[PDB]
């Protein structure tokens, strides 16, 4: 009976591949070939936050486009004030092995996680004045790799045990779990409408999820190595994934297939983080070659290099209003570019 | 600039706190445990007292050791091994009562992040290895062995195979045989770590 199931799966895969290949009327390059290029994007460093003493793996902007939080390996999560480079908070961590962080859209909470398999929720507006942990979410087997805040209560986390989870901070329980990935899930992004989200795993496949129903809808493949980052298009109907093959790819949700590949024969190091712009025109990716490249999304042409880091950049993210770009690296310095 | 001055003094105070905490925490020495399943890591971490990562810290002759057992992470090693790029030494454990550990040693000794970090090799269950030798020749595990059948030569052969995997001339491998009933583990670790500290500081000064 196993052979029959395998044959049915192969037939379904052939059918879906034929359907996907039938809808490729033209490539994205042939459509956006007649538009003017972006040109040269020369960005100069504006600020520099010299507070950390070890490697940095996470940096998430605030909803007010002024406060930023960075999690480092010194066991400290220091909330920054980008306008004046002022340290406003310094939260010690129980587990110094942290590789992700998030800042709540309301601003009242900060989440962090790592090799301890626990997503810790911190409260920043306590009446006592200090910052204390409010909830310790536990239940993952593999290391937590990413976490985002849907709202002031719920939180979605992508762990390394081939599972993505939906939690309730009020009760501290796994409301909904998602399964289907074969390898470690190393990235997560939530849609602007907070109803859909996607995960980039180490099995070279990107999947789309439903927060409410809890079942997968589409599966995207085409990468040759593990996926390290993911980010929706500002319109919410597309996303881009950066892999360890030194290439970026763009996927269309309605077309259900890849659109463009951002590859250059010069670059060989892997990609650590990706992020769009406010208008979705520029795609900034953080390579392991100590530099950040700017990719024109609609033409796959390089527009400038944000060199200046002494080590590999581990995180990148633009502000909500798009007035600045933050790059965190392993050299303990987070720089605000504009 | 009314209450911005208070913001500046708060920022300077917490920056001073961060610097003081970093200076205080730079004193501790970091060690990384590794090995096969049920290879004897638990025995040595429990002999010194005190699902995710397991941290054990003990002080022995004015040195603050911090062992990071990471055997509980049942995931891909490549995606989190770089977090320990700054450890002083890698404590490697091999069970002599069992081939599968050679691949792990080769992978961990030639990794790009550990080209300059030494490996301290502990061989456990020496009595069990001798009992197996008496019961069966050591050629079952190593079909290419051509020699006598006793404890000493088999131990030397296993040591040679485990040491031949090194390729960088800037790293050293310290080895020791444990009988699972001795308290010399702390002394061996201390004597290896002091030499490693001396070598690291000399190489930093450039005199090495």
């Amino acid at each position, epitope marked *: 009976e196993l052979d029959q199931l395998r044959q049915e799966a192969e037939q379904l895969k052939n059918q879906i591949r034929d359907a996907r290949k039938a809808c490729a009327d033209a490539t994205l390059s042939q459509i956006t070939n007649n538009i003017d290029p972006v040109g040269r994007i020369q960005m100069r460093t504006r600020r520099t936050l010299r507070g950390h003493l070890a490697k940095i793996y996470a940096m998430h902007w605030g909803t007010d486009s002024r406060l930023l939080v960075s999690a480092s390996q010194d066991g400290k999560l220091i909330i920054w004030d980008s306008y004046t480079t002022n340290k406003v908070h310094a939260i010690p961590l129980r587990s110094s092995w942290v590789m992700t962080c998030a800042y709540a859209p309301s601003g009242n909470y900060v989440a962090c996680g790592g090799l301890d398999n626990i997503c810790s929720i911190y409260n920043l507006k306590t009446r*006592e004045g200090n910052v204390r942990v409010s909830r310790e979410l536990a239940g993952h087997t593999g290391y937590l790799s990413c976490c985002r805040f849907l709202d002031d209560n719920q939180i979605v986390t992508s762990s390394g045990d081939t599972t993505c989870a939906l939690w309730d901070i009020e009760t501290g329980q796994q409301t909904t779990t998602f399964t289907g990935h074969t390898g470690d899930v190393m990235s997560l992004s939530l849609a602007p409408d907070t109803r859909l989200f996607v995960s980039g795993a180490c099995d070279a496949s990107a999947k789309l999820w439903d927060v409410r129903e809890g079942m997968c809808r589409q599966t995207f493949t085409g990468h040759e190595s593990d996926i390290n980052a993911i980010c929706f298009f500002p319109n919410g109907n597309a996303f881009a994934t950066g892999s360890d093959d030194a290439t970026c790819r763009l996927f269309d949700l309605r077309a259900d297939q890849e659109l463009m590949t951002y590859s250059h024969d010069n670059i060989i190091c892997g990609i650590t983080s990706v992020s769009f712009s406010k208008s979705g025109r520029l795609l900034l990716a953080g390579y392991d070659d100590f530099n950040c490249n700017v990719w024109d999304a609609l033409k796959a042409d390089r527009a400038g290099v944000l060199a200046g880091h002494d080590n590999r950049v581990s995180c990148l993210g633009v502000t909500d209003d798009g007035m600045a770009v933050a790059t965190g690296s392993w050299d303990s310095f987070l720089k605000i570019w504009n | 600039s*009314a209450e911005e001055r208070a913001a500046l003094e708060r920022s300077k105070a917490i920056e001073k706190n961060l610097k003081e905490d970093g200076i205080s925490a730079a004193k501790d020495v970091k060690l990384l445990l590794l090995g096969a399943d049920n290879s004897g890591k638990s025995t040595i971490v429990k002999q010194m007292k005190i699902t995710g990562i397991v941290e054990t810290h003990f002080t022995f002759k004015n040195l603050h050791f911090r062992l990071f057992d990471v055997g509980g992470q049942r995931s891909e090693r490549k995606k989190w091994i770089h977090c320990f790029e700054d450890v002083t030494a890698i404590i490697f454990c091999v069970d002599l009562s069992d081939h599968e550990s050679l691949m792990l040693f080769d992978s961990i000794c030639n990794n790009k992040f550990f080209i300059d970090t030494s490996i301290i090799l502990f061989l456990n269950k020496k009595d069990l290895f001798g009992e197996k030798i008496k019961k069966s020749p050591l050629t079952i595990c190593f079909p290419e062995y051509t020699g006598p059948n006793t404890y000493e030569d088999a131990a030397a052969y296993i040591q040679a195979q485990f040491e031949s995997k090194n390729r960088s001339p800037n790293k050293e491998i310290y080895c020791h045989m444990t009988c699972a009933t001795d308290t010399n583990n702390a002394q061996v670790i201390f004597d290896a770590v002091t030499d490693i500290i001396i070598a690291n500081n000399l190489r930093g000064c450039g005199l090495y």
Partner: single-chain antibody
Amino acid sequence: DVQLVESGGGLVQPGGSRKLSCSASGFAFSSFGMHWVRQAPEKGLEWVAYISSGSGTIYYADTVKGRFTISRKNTLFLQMTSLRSEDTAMYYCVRSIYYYGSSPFDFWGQGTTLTVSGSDIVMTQATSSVPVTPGESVSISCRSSKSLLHSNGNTYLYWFLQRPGQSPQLLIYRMSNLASGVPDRFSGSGSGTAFTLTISRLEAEDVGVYYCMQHLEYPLTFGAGTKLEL
């Protein structure tokens, strides 16, 4: 929860000395700055002294400089020397923490009563009293001698409410934000020098005396107050 109980007042002959101690509990006192605000038995509030976190910066009013001393075990002290007949008042202990988005002067102490036998930004409240019926909207106006809007864009007009026979409570900070724990009916606004605070659906809990305070430069000059009697 939070609590700032204090004692040390009483009857002092002129030329004597005393020591008022503020005991703080229920919060991280080491990270909170502490102020000192007194009030005459019939007049309004007036700033006295201020000490920062870690005893870094200390300030005094022009009329008290040299005579007093502020020092900080979770306890705040106010060394007091050469008491004169003008120093009789009720002294309050006030906490305040300053960072981005912080809420200074959020909590006030119970208070102690003590009985003794040029560059200031002048703030005036023209309306001494306002008779208002319950359920009707009211307004309180304040003025200034200098513009309180700094270059960064934050105005520094603070609004307080003093219920009859009770310690003051923070209502609106930075002339636009609402303090925690106060109902949303309160609202405030202003422009440069003139400030106003509006109340909708007034109830019995809104009866009291409202105070207008600035924070742009020391000394922190208070207002004469507006009495919103029933």
